[PDB]
């Protein structure tokens, strides 16, 4: 927009004519060919952090459905309490989720409470 005669950073045309966004970060993070990063991008807390950063809803509810289908072989009482509190804070702030996943969260929370 002003002057371009001396390239301070040696970036070719493939990098000069490309507007980077936010999804490319997750794209390259999932495309990481390293086995360590590939295993870290498939656990629980890493994907939770990624979904919290991306503020997604479709993939988030899909992964929650897969978690509910798998069962309680990953979540615990403190995890369920934190998830319920986060959902309550999100509902108090703005937007909401689905009635099915909401009643499932509520029934799992009260089951853990009575346990």
């Amino acid at each position: 927009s002003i002057i371009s005669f001396n390239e301070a950073n040696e970036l070719p045309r493939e990098y000069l004519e490309a507007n980077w966004t936010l999804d490319s970060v997750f794209e390259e993070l999932q495309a990481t060919d390293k086995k360590r990063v590939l295993e870290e991008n498939r656990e629980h807390y890493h994907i939770i952090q990624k979904f919290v950063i991306l503020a997604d809803v479709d993939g988030l509810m899909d992964e929650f459905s897969e978690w509910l289908s798998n069962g309680k072989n990953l979540l615990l009482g403190h995890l369920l309490r934190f998830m319920t509190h986060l959902l309550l804070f999100f509902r108090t702030l703005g937007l909401q989720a689905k009635e099915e996943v909401s009643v499932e969260v509520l029934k799992t929370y009260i089951q853990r409470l009575i346990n």
């Binding site: 002003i2 966004t21 936010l22 950063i53």
Partner: protein, 58 residues
């Protein structure tokens, strides 16, 4: 927001501060950067005092 001023001036810090209000992407980027810096600072712990147990001089 609203844009009306686009003439540049001296010192690129002013242009950076003006562009900071033009897009929130770099805003949350630098926010996450500062958050990671604070995470590293909290994870370092009492290393400043642990150094004194073996800091040299000569």
């Amino acid at each position: 927001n609203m844009f009306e001023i686009a003439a540049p001036n001296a010192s690129e810090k002013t242009i950076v501060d003006k562009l900071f209000q033009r897009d929130t992407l770099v805003r949350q980027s630098q926010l996450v950067v500062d958050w990671l810096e604070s995470i590293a600072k909290d994870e370092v712990g009492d290393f400043s005092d642990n150094i004194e147990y073996y800091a040299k001089s000569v």
